[PDB]
Ligand binder design. Structure first.
Ligand code: 2X3
Ligand code: 2X3
Ligand code: 2X3
Lengths: 124, 124, 124
């Protein structure tokens, strides 16, 4: 039994107006980043129930951080998962990143029909 | 890693007729107290999934006890949660008490529109 | 804290045509056995949430195996559950077997109205 951790990233690519709306609605009720962070945290804790062969685990830590990248017309999501145990937490990190990305998508899709999620991958 | 425990209480205040109906339907199919106890136990085990920042834990014990207080026109709910681990179980105890209270409410609301839940708090 | 395990079996009895359809659709998209295995695995991990008094546990292993028994006009399901902990996994094994059986039933019920599930029991 050891300390295990994993980090993942995801991106959501969108038009400039769409990203500007996220930036302008930040820190207000309906905060896209706040909502996506909570969604990702909740999703990480449910990973065992979403991915058939994953084991139930006791996550002691899940972090989801989001940043606008206006220069690339996209949002970057980075996640961190940690626990002390025998099973790793790669899928928790990826699932948290993915559901955070889907939540950004959900909150922007009225404005834009052709957003793209990706890449979604582990960080070294 | 130690033995951790928490106790909570909740109250549901109602008219005398409403409480009398609970007392009279006790030990029969549709037992309000039996249903509320099971709801509270189930809710305690799901606390991590209801409260965003709570950690998943392995509850080894959850107890929910209910008593009519005819003298005060109310039901009192007391809960107990225990486990051996590194994280406490205050939220499990409060959530079990709260959902037990909501279940009493649900089973009585046809009869009464203005029941009040509270206080809900930890016990020392 | 020790290694704990449990094994269960379940049977679904059906007409010969119904069983033949399962055998003939095996290894194809809509594989009844593949679907039932995944359902049973997922169900085992949720046992604590289905059975009110069961404890949440960290299952390290769940196996679900299915075999056609043409000679008896039935499907046999055998399950295995294991973990290292203080609480046994009998209910996880039985629940995995039961939900696997219900999934076989679901996937065959258009064809047959009078299938029977049982026995469902622990193995020694
Ligand atoms: N929650 C959660 N669970 C996880 C992962 C995760 O990131 N998060 N990674 C691992 N894990 C689940 O188990 C896989 C690894 O298999 P395992 O080594 O536990 O199987 P064993 O019991 O050793 O036996 P074999 O099956 O190896 O023979 C796996 O790749 C998942 O399927
Ligand atoms: N199921 C469940 N979970 C619970 C509680 C509960 O009653 N029941 N209480 C605790 N806990 C969750 O974690 C909170 C306490 O934070 P923590 O001390 O674990 O965080 P750490 O990993 O130490 O890092 P920081 O974030 O402290 O820097 C908390 O207050 C909950 O948010
Ligand atoms: N997931 C899951 N959980 C399980 C089982 C299972 O197969 N799978 N078997 C056990 N268990 C739940 O706990 C029952 C056994 O009770 P227990 O010995 O834990 O209670 P204690 O805390 O010792 O106190 P008392 O209540 O004994 O006084 C039980 O029979 C279940 O109710």
């Amino acid at each position: 039994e050891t300390v295990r951790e994993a980090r993942a990233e995801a991106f959501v690519t969108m038009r400039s107006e769409t990203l500007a709306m996220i930036i302008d609605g930040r820190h207000h009720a309906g905060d896209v980043f706040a909502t996506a962070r909570i969604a990702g945290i909740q999703a990480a804790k449910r990973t065992w129930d979403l991915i058939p062969l994953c084991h139930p685990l006791m996550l002691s830590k899940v972090e989801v951080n989001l940043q606008a990248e206006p220069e690339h017309n996209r949002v970057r999501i980075e996640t961190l998962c940690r626990l002390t145990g025998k099973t790793g937490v790669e899928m928790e990190a990826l699932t948290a990143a993915s559901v955070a990305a889907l939540t950004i998508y959900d909150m922007c899709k009225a404005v834009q029909k052709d957003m793209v999620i990706g890449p979604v991958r582990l960080l070294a």
